[PDB]
Amino acid sequence: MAEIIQERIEDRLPELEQLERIGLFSHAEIKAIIKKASDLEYKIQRRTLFKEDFINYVQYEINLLELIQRRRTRIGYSFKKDEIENSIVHRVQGVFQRASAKWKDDVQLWLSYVAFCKKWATKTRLSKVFSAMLAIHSNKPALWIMAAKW
Amino acid sequence: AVAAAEEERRLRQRNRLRLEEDKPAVERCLEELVFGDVENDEDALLRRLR
Amino acid sequence: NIRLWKANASEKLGVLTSREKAAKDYNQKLKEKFQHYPHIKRIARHRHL
Amino acid sequence: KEKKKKEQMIDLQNLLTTQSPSVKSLAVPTIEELEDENHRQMIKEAFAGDDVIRDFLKEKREAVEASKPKDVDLTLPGWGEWGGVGLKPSAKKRRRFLIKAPEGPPRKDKNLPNVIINEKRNIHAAAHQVRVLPYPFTHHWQFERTIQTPIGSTWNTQRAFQKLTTPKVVT
Amino acid sequence: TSIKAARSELLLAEEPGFLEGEDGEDTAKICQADIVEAVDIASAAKHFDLNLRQFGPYRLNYSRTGRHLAFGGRRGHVAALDWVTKKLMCEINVMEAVRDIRFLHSEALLAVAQNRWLHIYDNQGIELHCIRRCDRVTRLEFLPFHFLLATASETGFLTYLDVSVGKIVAALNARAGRLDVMSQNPYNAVIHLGHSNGTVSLWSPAMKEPLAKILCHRGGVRAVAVDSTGTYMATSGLDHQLKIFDLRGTYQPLSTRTLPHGAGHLAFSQRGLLVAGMGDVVNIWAGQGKASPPSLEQPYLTHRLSGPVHGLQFCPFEDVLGVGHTGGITSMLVPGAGEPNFDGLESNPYRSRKQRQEWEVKALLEKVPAELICLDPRALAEVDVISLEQGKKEQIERLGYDPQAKAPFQPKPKQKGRSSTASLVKRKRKVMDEEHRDKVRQSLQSALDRFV
């Protein structure tokens, strides 16, 4: 139960405390992120699972990634991408992998995974996503063209 | 290293000031998604309700 | 005859859940932590012969 | 010897100080209510009793006296020498057959003037403890540090619990 | 540990309350009416005044989880209720006087100290056990992690009862007269007893004599209390003194003040606030508490009750103080008294029945035996060095016999001429001679000057 939920929140702490050290976020804003991330974590760690909670979890991190990006430009701070951005991106990929395993037949979920990998992920990561999708969806000619186009 | 820590402390204070003075309308829209719409000051909340 | 035995006589063989694995590691560390206490030694080392 | 009891009466009288300041804005309890109706200022000292410090000093004295070891005289009055009412074993013979018990460890409450501490050991609790230092440890403090640190999830975060319970062989 | 401390606050979600005056205002003169209007409606509902004048003055106990409250009247009125919601679990009439009330590890079980014996009740009013041994009990107090209930009696006896099994583990004769003042150390699990001598005695079920005696007052001790950490002890007496002692190996008075009257009742909150019960008047001192005892210089809050006070306790995880008196029961609002962040697995106010019954099984499997209670909770880690004969002696008293002693030799009856009892005395003598060899071996382990 929450011991897995408590497991995941502690992993989020080291990047949040770095955001406080740079001054990008205030201490009150750090508290708000922790509270909302905990609520989204409870939905996806239940015994009863819905596709909508995974989308809500993913959409929250994307909005958080944009808010960090806009503030870094105004400060002109470009360091510590690995400790902050790569931590969030790696966590989002785990959620997509769990969701794609649960709902293999949903092409829209697969394409959303591909769209995120283009914007935020390494090209070698996107190579795996196309190969995984084409393995179970080889009967759709349009999906082949999208991989060849890329 | 005490002065170096104080140097980092004022750098946080300088960056925190610059991030609050001027905020584009896009950032306000994003901040509601990430932080929510919560008011903890009583008179400020009363102005919102009225 | 040929006989088959368990190398560890108390472990559970099948696929385990996270709570089962967490308790098993906790039990092993607890036994090692208090291995020198007289009551622990008396029970642990008793074999029927 | 009476110098010691004088001194140990002195410092006990010093710890249990009689004069102390009062509380400033303290709400005053009701002492009297007039049905046909007013808090009144008090005399500070409105108590008398038995001399408690004397009793405590007595009791600590007998507690100390009981716990000390004993000196055993094994002299037999007429063993190998003449014995009778007028005749007594010589002082040198008393010295030769008077065994002294070894001087014991210091009491926990010698320097604690207002405290009396029992010296008897809890044998039932001692039944559980380890008697000899185990092999890999070279100092007692190392072993007690190892025992004292909790490993359960009650006292540790989940990462701390998992790193503290890491198995050595995984197959 | 600061980085370990730093990670702590982020996980913690709540902050303690405060109360600061402005423009030189004294918080002592602030009344409860001003606080109620200035705080949210949920907290305002926690301030109420029950009026029960017909029956005697009331003693109260809060459940270990702050959800439940139980109280008992002197004339024999006993009722248990949820206090957050205003529902009545039970209200019964015990047919004689009641001196104390305590919960037992949950809200399910109630123990009452009646006039003549001790009784056990359900939270619905059903009597469960009547303990005939415990008689004329004045004070009750429960040790949670050992499942022990401690009783102080009029006759001068201190008794320990194991509620898990139902057996009395120990019954100790204090031999100091009447016993009426009792408290426990949550950190230490020892029992503190006050006396007219001016001394406080420390007791454990293992010993037949007190662990320690400390002289604290020039008159009779009327109240005693210790903090949750086990560091400080607060006492009051007929000598009009409030004292704070350091229990961490020092036993010296850290602070002293003179009072109009000796404090009948004292208590500690979970954040270190100290409350004194003086007749019909209640006074609260607050201190920073960060490695420091509370400041006795000036009180933090005050209130005047309708009748003289007969019982005080802070709710575990709330900013409220429960007061029992002759008029009835009142609830005060004390901002900053309760500990904000509770653990969901040990004492959850917001727990279901299935969560509760999982917790109790865990605790029952995990009970600490009675003999392990000592002044140091970590004494089991320490390695005891004693002589080999010292261990041999101690094994005898705990058992009543030597388990390695050899019984005197008796020859077995044998055939071919060896059963005539003339051979038995011969074979016995032969063996005893061989053993006699062993003990004697162990026992041994100028010109004319030449003729002299």
JSON list of C-alpha atoms in Angstrom, two decimals, chain A residues 12 16 19-20 23-40 59-71 74 88, chain B residues 16 19-20 23-24 26-40 48:
[
{"chain": "A", "resi": 12, "resn": "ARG", "atom": "CA", "xyz": [11.43, 12.80, -5.37]},
{"chain": "A", "resi": 16, "resn": "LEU", "atom": "CA", "xyz": [13.15, 19.14, -4.91]},
{"chain": "A", "resi": 19, "resn": "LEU", "atom": "CA", "xyz": [15.34, 23.41, -6.61]},
{"chain": "A", "resi": 20, "resn": "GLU", "atom": "CA", "xyz": [15.22, 25.17, -3.24]},
{"chain": "A", "resi": 23, "resn": "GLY", "atom": "CA", "xyz": [16.14, 29.62, -5.50]},
{"chain": "A", "resi": 24, "resn": "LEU", "atom": "CA", "xyz": [13.89, 28.63, -8.41]},
{"chain": "A", "resi": 25, "resn": "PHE", "atom": "CA", "xyz": [11.12, 27.54, -6.03]},
{"chain": "A", "resi": 26, "resn": "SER", "atom": "CA", "xyz": [10.18, 28.77, -2.58]},
{"chain": "A", "resi": 27, "resn": "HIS", "atom": "CA", "xyz": [9.83, 26.43, 0.39]},
{"chain": "A", "resi": 28, "resn": "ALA", "atom": "CA", "xyz": [6.04, 26.79, 0.37]},
{"chain": "A", "resi": 29, "resn": "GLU", "atom": "CA", "xyz": [5.96, 25.85, -3.32]},
{"chain": "A", "resi": 30, "resn": "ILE", "atom": "CA", "xyz": [8.01, 22.73, -2.50]},
{"chain": "A", "resi": 31, "resn": "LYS", "atom": "CA", "xyz": [5.34, 21.72, 0.02]},
{"chain": "A", "resi": 32, "resn": "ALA", "atom": "CA", "xyz": [2.55, 22.15, -2.54]},
{"chain": "A", "resi": 33, "resn": "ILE", "atom": "CA", "xyz": [4.32, 19.92, -5.08]},
{"chain": "A", "resi": 34, "resn": "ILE", "atom": "CA", "xyz": [4.84, 17.15, -2.51]},
{"chain": "A", "resi": 35, "resn": "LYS", "atom": "CA", "xyz": [1.18, 17.21, -1.45]},
{"chain": "A", "resi": 36, "resn": "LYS", "atom": "CA", "xyz": [-0.18, 17.05, -5.00]},
{"chain": "A", "resi": 37, "resn": "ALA", "atom": "CA", "xyz": [2.32, 14.39, -6.09]},
{"chain": "A", "resi": 38, "resn": "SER", "atom": "CA", "xyz": [1.25, 12.24, -3.13]},
{"chain": "A", "resi": 39, "resn": "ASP", "atom": "CA", "xyz": [-2.41, 12.45, -4.17]},
{"chain": "A", "resi": 40, "resn": "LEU", "atom": "CA", "xyz": [-1.60, 11.38, -7.73]},
{"chain": "A", "resi": 59, "resn": "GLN", "atom": "CA", "xyz": [0.34, 15.41, -17.43]},
{"chain": "A", "resi": 60, "resn": "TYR", "atom": "CA", "xyz": [1.30, 16.81, -14.02]},
{"chain": "A", "resi": 61, "resn": "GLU", "atom": "CA", "xyz": [5.01, 16.15, -14.55]},
{"chain": "A", "resi": 62, "resn": "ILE", "atom": "CA", "xyz": [4.90, 17.67, -18.04]},
{"chain": "A", "resi": 63, "resn": "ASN", "atom": "CA", "xyz": [3.36, 20.85, -16.62]},
{"chain": "A", "resi": 64, "resn": "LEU", "atom": "CA", "xyz": [6.02, 20.83, -13.90]},
{"chain": "A", "resi": 65, "resn": "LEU", "atom": "CA", "xyz": [8.74, 20.44, -16.53]},
{"chain": "A", "resi": 66, "resn": "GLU", "atom": "CA", "xyz": [7.47, 23.48, -18.45]},
{"chain": "A", "resi": 67, "resn": "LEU", "atom": "CA", "xyz": [7.28, 25.63, -15.31]},
{"chain": "A", "resi": 68, "resn": "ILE", "atom": "CA", "xyz": [10.91, 24.82, -14.49]},
{"chain": "A", "resi": 69, "resn": "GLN", "atom": "CA", "xyz": [12.00, 25.58, -18.06]},
{"chain": "A", "resi": 70, "resn": "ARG", "atom": "CA", "xyz": [10.39, 29.03, -18.15]},
{"chain": "A", "resi": 71, "resn": "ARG", "atom": "CA", "xyz": [11.91, 30.04, -14.81]},
{"chain": "A", "resi": 74, "resn": "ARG", "atom": "CA", "xyz": [14.52, 34.32, -16.60]},
{"chain": "A", "resi": 88, "resn": "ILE", "atom": "CA", "xyz": [11.66, 13.67, -13.73]},
{"chain": "B", "resi": 16, "resn": "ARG", "atom": "CA", "xyz": [13.80, 34.64, -5.55]},
{"chain": "B", "resi": 19, "resn": "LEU", "atom": "CA", "xyz": [11.17, 35.45, -10.15]},
{"chain": "B", "resi": 20, "resn": "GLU", "atom": "CA", "xyz": [8.24, 37.16, -8.39]},
{"chain": "B", "resi": 23, "resn": "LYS", "atom": "CA", "xyz": [5.43, 37.08, -14.33]},
{"chain": "B", "resi": 24, "resn": "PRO", "atom": "CA", "xyz": [3.98, 36.46, -17.82]},
{"chain": "B", "resi": 26, "resn": "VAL", "atom": "CA", "xyz": [1.57, 31.96, -19.35]},
{"chain": "B", "resi": 27, "resn": "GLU", "atom": "CA", "xyz": [3.44, 31.40, -16.08]},
{"chain": "B", "resi": 28, "resn": "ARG", "atom": "CA", "xyz": [0.36, 32.29, -14.02]},
{"chain": "B", "resi": 29, "resn": "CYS", "atom": "CA", "xyz": [-1.65, 29.73, -15.99]},
{"chain": "B", "resi": 30, "resn": "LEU", "atom": "CA", "xyz": [1.02, 27.08, -15.38]},
{"chain": "B", "resi": 31, "resn": "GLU", "atom": "CA", "xyz": [1.36, 27.91, -11.68]},
{"chain": "B", "resi": 32, "resn": "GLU", "atom": "CA", "xyz": [-2.31, 27.14, -11.05]},
{"chain": "B", "resi": 33, "resn": "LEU", "atom": "CA", "xyz": [-1.83, 23.70, -12.63]},
{"chain": "B", "resi": 34, "resn": "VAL", "atom": "CA", "xyz": [1.26, 22.93, -10.55]},
{"chain": "B", "resi": 35, "resn": "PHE", "atom": "CA", "xyz": [0.49, 24.64, -7.23]},
{"chain": "B", "resi": 36, "resn": "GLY", "atom": "CA", "xyz": [-3.30, 25.04, -7.26]},
{"chain": "B", "resi": 37, "resn": "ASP", "atom": "CA", "xyz": [-5.45, 28.01, -6.30]},
{"chain": "B", "resi": 38, "resn": "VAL", "atom": "CA", "xyz": [-5.13, 28.29, -2.51]},
{"chain": "B", "resi": 39, "resn": "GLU", "atom": "CA", "xyz": [-5.34, 31.46, -0.41]},
{"chain": "B", "resi": 40, "resn": "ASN", "atom": "CA", "xyz": [-4.24, 31.24, 3.22]},
{"chain": "B", "resi": 48, "resn": "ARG", "atom": "CA", "xyz": [-11.92, 36.72, -3.48]}
]
